[PDB]
Design a protein around this motif. Structure first.
Motif, PDB file in Angstrom:
ATOM      1  N   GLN A   7       0.675  -1.153  -0.039  1.00 26.89           N
ATOM      2  CA  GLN A   7      -0.114  -0.165  -0.089  1.00 26.89           C
ATOM      3  C   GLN A   7       0.799   1.207  -0.216  1.00 26.89           C
ATOM      4  O   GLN A   7       2.081   1.297   0.679  1.00 26.89           O
ATOM      5  CB  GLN A   7      -0.815   0.056   1.302  1.00 26.89           C
ATOM      6  CG  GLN A   7      -2.043  -1.123   1.310  1.00 26.89           C
ATOM      7  CD  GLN A   7      -2.805  -0.872   2.607  1.00 26.89           C
ATOM      8  OE1 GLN A   7      -2.519  -1.049   3.581  1.00 26.89           O
ATOM      9  NE2 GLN A   7      -4.163  -0.533   2.157  1.00 26.89           N
ATOM     10  N   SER A   8       0.321   2.326  -0.668  1.00 27.14           N
ATOM     11  CA  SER A   8       1.123   3.521  -0.845  1.00 27.14           C
ATOM     12  C   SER A   8       2.508   3.499  -0.712  1.00 27.14           C
ATOM     13  O   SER A   8       3.180   2.947  -1.752  1.00 27.14           O
ATOM     14  CB  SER A   8       0.539   4.617   0.508  1.00 27.14           C
ATOM     15  OG  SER A   8      -0.978   4.761   0.360  1.00 27.14           O
ATOM     16  N   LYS A  25      -2.686  -0.769 -10.320  1.00 32.61           N
ATOM     17  CA  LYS A  25      -2.291   0.192  -9.404  1.00 32.61           C
ATOM     18  C   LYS A  25      -3.330   1.343  -9.637  1.00 32.61           C
ATOM     19  O   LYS A  25      -3.708   2.038 -10.578  1.00 32.61           O
ATOM     20  CB  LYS A  25      -0.839   1.098  -9.863  1.00 32.61           C
ATOM     21  CG  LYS A  25      -0.432   1.821  -8.957  1.00 32.61           C
ATOM     22  CD  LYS A  25       0.912   2.422  -9.563  1.00 32.61           C
ATOM     23  CE  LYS A  25       1.662   3.360  -8.500  1.00 32.61           C
ATOM     24  NZ  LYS A  25       3.000   3.997  -8.993  1.00 32.61           N
ATOM     25  N   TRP A  27      -4.860   4.930  -7.525  1.00 35.58           N
ATOM     26  CA  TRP A  27      -4.657   6.077  -6.624  1.00 35.58           C
ATOM     27  C   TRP A  27      -5.446   7.435  -6.797  1.00 35.58           C
ATOM     28  O   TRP A  27      -5.876   7.582  -7.906  1.00 35.58           O
ATOM     29  CB  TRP A  27      -3.027   6.449  -6.834  1.00 35.58           C
ATOM     30  CG  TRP A  27      -2.504   6.966  -7.929  1.00 35.58           C
ATOM     31  CD1 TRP A  27      -2.267   8.402  -8.175  1.00 35.58           C
ATOM     32  CD2 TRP A  27      -2.294   6.437  -9.361  1.00 35.58           C
ATOM     33  NE1 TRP A  27      -1.889   8.498  -9.491  1.00 35.58           N
ATOM     34  CE2 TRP A  27      -1.889   7.430 -10.324  1.00 35.58           C
ATOM     35  CE3 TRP A  27      -2.335   5.083  -9.737  1.00 35.58           C
ATOM     36  CZ2 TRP A  27      -1.377   7.310 -11.389  1.00 35.58           C
ATOM     37  CZ3 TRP A  27      -1.984   4.840 -11.112  1.00 35.58           C
ATOM     38  CH2 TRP A  27      -1.594   5.793 -11.798  1.00 35.58           C
ATOM     39  N   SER A  29      -6.224  11.137  -3.582  1.00 36.09           N
ATOM     40  CA  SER A  29      -5.684  11.555  -2.836  1.00 36.09           C
ATOM     41  C   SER A  29      -6.910  12.260  -1.600  1.00 36.09           C
ATOM     42  O   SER A  29      -8.080  12.284  -2.127  1.00 36.09           O
ATOM     43  CB  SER A  29      -5.007  13.013  -2.910  1.00 36.09           C
ATOM     44  OG  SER A  29      -3.915  12.717  -3.901  1.00 36.09           O
ATOM     45  N   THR A  34      -1.628  11.350  -1.100  1.00 38.16           N
ATOM     46  CA  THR A  34      -1.980  10.175  -2.203  1.00 38.16           C
ATOM     47  C   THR A  34      -2.162   8.847  -1.559  1.00 38.16           C
ATOM     48  O   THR A  34      -1.189   8.405  -0.585  1.00 38.16           O
ATOM     49  CB  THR A  34      -0.887  10.052  -3.087  1.00 38.16           C
ATOM     50  OG1 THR A  34      -0.817  11.451  -3.860  1.00 38.16           O
ATOM     51  CG2 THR A  34      -1.030   8.886  -4.198  1.00 38.16           C
ATOM     52  N   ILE A  36      -2.572   4.838  -2.458  1.00 42.69           N
ATOM     53  CA  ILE A  36      -2.215   3.635  -3.542  1.00 42.69           C
ATOM     54  C   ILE A  36      -2.445   2.457  -3.209  1.00 42.69           C
ATOM     55  O   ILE A  36      -1.944   1.902  -2.050  1.00 42.69           O
ATOM     56  CB  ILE A  36      -0.964   3.880  -4.230  1.00 42.69           C
ATOM     57  CG1 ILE A  36      -0.309   5.393  -4.136  1.00 42.69           C
ATOM     58  CG2 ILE A  36      -0.617   2.810  -5.308  1.00 42.69           C
ATOM     59  CD1 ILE A  36       1.022   5.527  -4.402  1.00 42.69           C
TER      60      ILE A  36
END
Length: 61
Positions: A7-8, A25, A27, A29, A34, A36
């Motif tokens: 994650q992220s 992937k 994503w 915000s 952000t 991901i």
């Protein structure tokens, strides 16, 4: 097919998919920054989200 699934900004990790022919992937915000998500497949996403579906090993970092 091997795909990233961390994650992220976490330390990268991968999983070996069991049939899927895509890695993804996604994503977007929030107030913190952000977010991901990564994994096997190519899911339908909510409008307004960024998405990359690729077809090669570890292509979704």
């Amino acid at each position: 097919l091997e795909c990233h699934n961390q994650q992220s900004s976490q330390t990268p990790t991968t999983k070996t998919c069991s049939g899927e022919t895509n890695c993804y992937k996604k994503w977007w915000s929030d107030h913190r920054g952000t977010i991901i998500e990564r994994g096997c497949g190519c899911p339908k996403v909510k409008p307004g989200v960024n998405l990359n579906c690729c077809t090669t090993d570890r292509c979704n970092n």
